[PDB]
């Protein structure tokens, strides 16, 4: 007998907002599961749940890397109000 | 006997809004599952749930990488109000 | 007999907001699990849950790395108010 | 995996022979069985294998029991030979 | 894994022979069994294997028991030979 | 893993032979068993294997027991030979 009681009442402005510049590897809210709720299981073999192997931002082989850039970031944010009254 | 009680009452402005620039690898809200609720299972073999293997933002072989760019980011946000009254 | 009582009532502005510049490897809110709730399980073998192997920001082989850049970061944030009254 | 190896090579003159007088309750070679060889059985309920309840040779109610008998037992057995050579 | 190796090579003149007089309750070679060989059985309830309840040779109620008998037992046995050579 | 090796090579003239008079309660060679060989059994309840309850040779209620008997036992046994050579 397994009983699970999961509650997530409220979320306000969870993630990734009001950003001038976002880049790169940013996966979010990803759920990978096997036999999350299991009862009376004889066997389970050869399970592979590897998310990734190698993280390399710059991987160059016999390369000539010459980027020229002049980037100006001038984002403006005014009067942002977040309210979560709870009674 | 397995009993699950999952509640998600409210979400307001979850993700990825009011952004000047978004790029790259950003998958979201992805669910991959096998036998999430299982009862009286004899066996389960050779399960592969690998999400990915290799993350490489720049992967170059015998390359001449010469990008010239002049990018100006001038986004403006005014009077953003988020309200979640709860009584 | 397994009983689980998990509660997450409230979240306000969780992560990654009001940022001038975000880059790199930043995955978030990722859950990988195997047999999270298990009862009367005879055996489980050969489980692999490796998230990653190698983290290398700069990985170069026989490379000439000559980037020229003049980047100016001038983001402005005014009058940000976060309120979470609880009664 | 259940393996049963039952051998009964030889029987010679098993029972109830060369008898002058046999009477009464003598049942023989009676086998009563339920699920003699069973594998992976979830449940089994309300099994009744009672052979008998009450043994009463003389059961009399308000009876007048007056038997007169003159019985002579004069059986003769000569030169009975039992041979079971085993090589 | 259950392995049973039962051997009964030889029996010679097992029981109840060359008897002048046999009477009463004498059942023989009676086997009553439930789930003799069982593997991976969750439950088994309410099993009744009672052979008998009450043994009463003389059970009389308000009875007049007056038997007259003159019994002579004159059985003769000569030259009984039992041989079981084993080599 | 349960392994049973039972051997009963030889029996010669087991029981109840060459008897002048046999009476009463004499059951023989009776086997009553439940789950003789059992492996990985969760539960077993309410088992009743009572062979008998009460043994009363003379049970009389308000009885007049007046048996008259003149019994003569004159059985004769001559030259009984039992041989079990083992080499």
Numbering used by the authors:
A (entry chain D), B (entry chain B), C (entry chain F), D (entry chain A), E (entry chain C), F (entry chain E): 6 to 92
From the reporting publication:
High resolution structures, however, show that this polymorphism arises from the assembly of a common building block that is strikingly homogeneous and monomorphic.
Further 3D classification allowed the 2PF fibrils to be separated into two sub-types. Notably in this structure the N- and C-termini of each subunit adopt a ‘downwards’ conformation.
